Amino acid sequence: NDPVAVARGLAEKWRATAVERDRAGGSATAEREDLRASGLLSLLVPREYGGWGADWPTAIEVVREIAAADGSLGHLFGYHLTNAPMIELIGSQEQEEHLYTQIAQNNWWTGNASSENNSHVLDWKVRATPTEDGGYVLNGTKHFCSGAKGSDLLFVFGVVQDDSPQQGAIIAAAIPTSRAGVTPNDDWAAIGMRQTDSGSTDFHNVKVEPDEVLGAPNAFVLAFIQSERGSLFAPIAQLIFANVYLGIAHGALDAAREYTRTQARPWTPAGIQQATEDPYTIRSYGEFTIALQGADAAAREAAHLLQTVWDKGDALTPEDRGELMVKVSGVKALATNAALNISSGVFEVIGARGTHPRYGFDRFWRNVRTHSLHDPVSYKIADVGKHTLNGQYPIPGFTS
Amino acid sequence: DNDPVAVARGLAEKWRATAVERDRAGGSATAEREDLRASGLLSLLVPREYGGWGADWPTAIEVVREIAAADGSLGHLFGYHLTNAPMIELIGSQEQEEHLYTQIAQNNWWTGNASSENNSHVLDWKVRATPTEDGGYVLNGTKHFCSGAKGSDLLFVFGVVQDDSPQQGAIIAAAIPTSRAGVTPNDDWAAIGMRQTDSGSTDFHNVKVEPDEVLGAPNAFVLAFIQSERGSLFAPIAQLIFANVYLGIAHGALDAAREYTRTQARPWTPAGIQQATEDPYTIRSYGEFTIALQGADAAAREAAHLLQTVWDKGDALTPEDRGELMVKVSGVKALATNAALNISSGVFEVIGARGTHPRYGFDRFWRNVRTHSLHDPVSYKIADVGKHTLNGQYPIPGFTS
Amino acid sequence: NDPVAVARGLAEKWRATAVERDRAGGSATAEREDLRASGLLSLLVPREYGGWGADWPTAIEVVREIAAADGSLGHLFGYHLTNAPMIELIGSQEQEEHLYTQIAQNNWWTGNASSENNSHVLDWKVRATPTEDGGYVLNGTKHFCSGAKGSDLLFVFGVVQDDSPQQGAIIAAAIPTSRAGVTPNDDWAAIGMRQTDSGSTDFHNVKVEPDEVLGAPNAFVLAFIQSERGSLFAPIAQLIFANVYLGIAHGALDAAREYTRTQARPWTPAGIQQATEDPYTIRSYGEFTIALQGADAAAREAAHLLQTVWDKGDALTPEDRGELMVKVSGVKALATNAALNISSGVFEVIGARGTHPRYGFDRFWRNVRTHSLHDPVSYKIADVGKHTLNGQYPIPGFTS
Amino acid sequence: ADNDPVAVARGLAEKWRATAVERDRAGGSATAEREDLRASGLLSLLVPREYGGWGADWPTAIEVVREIAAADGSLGHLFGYHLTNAPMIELIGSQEQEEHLYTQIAQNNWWTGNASSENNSHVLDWKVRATPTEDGGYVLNGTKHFCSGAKGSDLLFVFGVVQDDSPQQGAIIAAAIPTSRAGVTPNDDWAAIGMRQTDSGSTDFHNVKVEPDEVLGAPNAFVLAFIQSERGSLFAPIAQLIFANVYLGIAHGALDAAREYTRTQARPWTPAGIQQATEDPYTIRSYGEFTIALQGADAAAREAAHLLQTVWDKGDALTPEDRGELMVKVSGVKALATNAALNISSGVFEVIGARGTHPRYGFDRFWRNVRTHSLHDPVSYKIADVGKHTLNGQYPIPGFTS
Ligand SMILES: Cc1cc2nc3c(=O)[nH]c(=O)nc-3n(C[C@H](O)[C@H](O)[C@H](O)COP(=O)(O)O)c2cc1C
């Protein structure tokens, strides 16, 4: 029983309500529950801890299949898969055994509260006072809490800010979402990705136990500067995002295809008698498929490289991580423009009647248009040209 | 010497405050329709001798563009209204022209149409038209797609004589009161964009058309298309309005993008960037958006002068004049569609992830353009130009070319 | 042992005279003898018959390495590699044994005076009269004959055009180029691909012996309609052309990169200090590499699909061939659009002084601008579009 | 003078189109064509009538450039540059230089060339030294490198950099001197993939005297004029708009040639059941996109031409706003012309086909011509200038190219 077959089954059912749920917005609890019951939430967990133990390429095909049915869910399951690796990326051998196992057998959803909204991306303003026993008390509020609402395990981030020399000490921690003080709000709203629960989360004196703290204080920053296994964060995240777009593009293409075949009318002023026999429609579809062909092929090739580097572990070099990031940055560019182009252009061949909300054909674009702004594609493109021309690798961070 | 453009700039700014709410709510925008009535711009294209502004096509288009930038739906609704009355000059009589123009101007009337089904065979048009001995007609049927029928004062309707007669298959053009017995404009329009265009159905139940309300002979439009006479300006006029409605929306999207970048946008600090307004790639994008519009606008404006030149020739216009005009308009339609789609979508790249929030409503510009750009296939506008360039062919005159 | 390393050595040697040989035109005769002496000519002939027995991906990477250094040499070697397979495609076992060994132990060049891609069967110049012994005699002048001049074994097509019951039948033959009446002219000239020797070739009462005829009369046309193993010609030929274009694209890009780092000057009116630190040059380089990334990944996937359908033998179904042709039809389009974009856009970052003939930078564009017109990329695109939308497979022929 | 200059240009364009192929492949100087231009009287096209000129407006002069450019990219460039050279005398020179030189140009029908750009570390780094002399003039030493028209010209517009123990140190001097002046050696060393007959070679200056009254304006007059956005700062808008129209001419040339081949030589793709080349729906689409791209680019260009005229007729009354706005428009036109000309000159081959790659048609000359000159200055910073204006209201830094 492979997880791609299970992913396909869930997709079939979610296409019926895709239009309903997209317009409605809000949380998609019913669908999130169906994903729990499938058991795909422990897809990247090894079999030793009651997981599927799937490789990255296999896991990506599952993400692509979910994303085609619904970009929000594809993104929800996407960010979910990126969260758990943080334990084995920086956390201890004790935390790895405990946290992976309890995710697997409880079928826990995972969310995170990392990015905020103040001066700029690199200006995180939530406190974390170090208690005498070792723990930390989180004070403040986040704004882009990807999938935090309705989740079980929350991968939170914070900063130490006081007179003591610990300024910009980035703490990571995985706590249960039922902890006192935490409040993931129902204020998420965007043009697309409407059911991705990327809202705010207020922290009113939320405690973090010694075992819940992931790695040393400012551990991620050290791994980024040294280009160690922790710096694989961005390469992993950015490939899943890219594959979510390509998924949405495939769904948009598949949805248009069937419409053209059964609903679209030929333009009779031009002497056309069949919509599927229109030369320019035929050309439009060729153009879309070929843009996906190129992008998908780059994506799958990049997935195998991620797996190769993943298998090395701590033995990975800056050269390995750099090249991978440049390739993934290249796939991010291809995915974005191919998804934006297809999701918009698909309307040309559908026609005027296809702007009726009952089809919801603009949901593909709205989903891609929204999440493509997560990080600027211009600098993904810029980071590749820097490598091409000067061999310069991207500075490791949360996105690069 | 009152300024038609400045009046439009006053409405836009008033609507700018409520622009986002209207888009999300949808339905009909009766409050905005009344503001345009009270401004008097509804008589923009009416000759001064009848009480209108007496404005030319270029000035008229500038007022349309300005309104379209504030609101895509209202720009289209006003835009389409302006093309309705000219129909009277194209095929109607001198009597009817003096009469119906005066009533529109002096009474500040909105106009709508239940006119052409441009991709349906004439015998499959829903509006049937039975003749009478006095010369009039009785209309029966439900038109699936109208333009501004709801809330209009005067309605320009096409019916087809689908009964055994010499008239069998003829298209009848009529201008009747919207409150004529049997006329029921439905509020059943629904789309991702152009939500307040009131482009729903309109039912006709034994609607009588009087002899003096019938515009020209039976099938006068189709006869005019075949001969490239004054009636064949229908497609050029309409297609050009649409193009400028698209260009208006893109300026709106570009204006709104700009203002967000200056006040709200944050600098990508991972790339050592201090200010959002000084980002090399953001600045490039704005250059490209402006450059693409620069080219489309300049072509549009050239086409309006050409439209005016052909308009001024009256009935003595030639198949060459009309043919060349439609080629230019076809080109502008393509330039407008491509630029508007690019800019209304591309603007998001410089705004940022926070700009996707409903309270800004930045996707309305795209939804409006993406929707109405499907009115007729841009691929064939492009092909008609290429057929002219390569083979010297002029488009076959009709409702959309 | 390693044919790619041998090619790198040839490219190394040729890159000193690349500029001059493009300018001069004519035959690349010295470089054609470097190719023979290397042994690469029998690359796609099985070990057992004297060749390298190389598989399709490997042979493609040799084409790419050659095409990168010189576009004419990439084409000429690429097309030669498609000629010999013709024997085991439509010919018998005895001829496969006889001809392959001859080609191998002699290290023969092959040319072609084969198909006319835009001509109705009863309009082809080269006509074949049936002889009493079972052979044919050719008469006419074919105008596009790549590699005919200087080749050892010529692949010639002829049509029977008379009152015979075998009217309009395409005869495929393999004869020595020195055969009486075979006169490959020295009349090729073009903006690019100047040294591909694709001039006309005259046939005047040229005898083709019974055993030199490949298969039955009209054996290719039959193979096409049935989608037999003979119909692999198009996907093979097309995929090689696609990899030639990408090779040339990599050539231009590597040459641009060298100039940008060594010669290019910074635009100081904007305040730029180094040409490598120019944001838009960096962007330009990202977009070129990104376009290549997608096109290359897609190309590679198609070589593995080619190998799979090649290894199936006669058990290949119309479906396999159809799916492969659509994939390669996409690849052909990506290679065309990427190569023309990069080889022209590369001038943007190079600058005015780089237009001097001594760099010869325009040769990359001229080469791909020339051969991209071999068959129309518009109908490559439409065939992909027809498959996507209507499940229709391309019409089996010499180009599709 | 009294006739329509665009009609005269068309006559010259017709005559040159019969030898365009051979002169492109041969390269070198187009001496016979340059002489055709001299004899036509069009070199005094922008000179006022009071000094013996044609007194044409900027839109008309630009139409002449476009018409010449469609026939021959190199001749369009050459005439275009000549039309940008002359204005410099009134832009920064005195009343007497205006009357004297313009009259000489009209009466003698002088070709003009320039010697301004160099081959140093970057385009602002100039090493052609100018030593002052106690009569007010200067002495020039060094080598210029992109000297379009310098060879065979009668009047050479040269830019020097002052070397002196004074405040004049590092000041830029503009001068108009006879090309035959002792020391000045225009070289015959111009080679390029395109613009092959523009004679943009090197020019050596060996103890070249620049007499006091041949100096145009005070020391650093251009640099001052740029900073103040005064009438002298119209150089960039004028030159850049002319270049854009050279590219558009060439684009039209490419499309016209393509069209005629498509109609006469091209064959239909018979595997797709296409009957005639002109009926192919994708060929039709291609020509439509070519025409559409040029429709927009040409209209933009014409708009900018009228705006230049407007600004030009204000004289000294022009403001930094007027100048900066004008330059924004032209920078946009430069971009539209660049990418339209490139896209069409290359794209035209898809509808022409393989047999049209033969050198006897010389079909790649349009692209090679555009591809070459499009690199005069970077289109990325024309686009960026427009972005700075749109986003922040900022006007371009006045210089020789912006
Ligand atoms: C560089 C180049 C190489 C070519 N090589 C061959 C060849 O080896 N065999 C062949 O039959 N045709 C060859 N052709 C011919 C093309 O198939 C032909 O140009 C096209 O199908 C029809 O040409 P047209 O579009 O000019 O009518 C070649 C064409 C070019 C431009």
Ligand SMILES: Cc1cc2nc3c(=O)[nH]c(=O)nc-3n(C[C@H](O)[C@H](O)[C@H](O)COP(=O)(O)O)c2cc1C
């Ligand atoms: C065809 C052509 C003609 C040119 N003509 C001139 C000229 O007449 N005067 C001049 O100062 N520069 C001329 N230039 C040069 C530009 O002003 C600029 O210095 C040059 O393109 C920058 O060189 P780079 O790109 O190698 O840095 C010309 C360039 C080209 C390609």
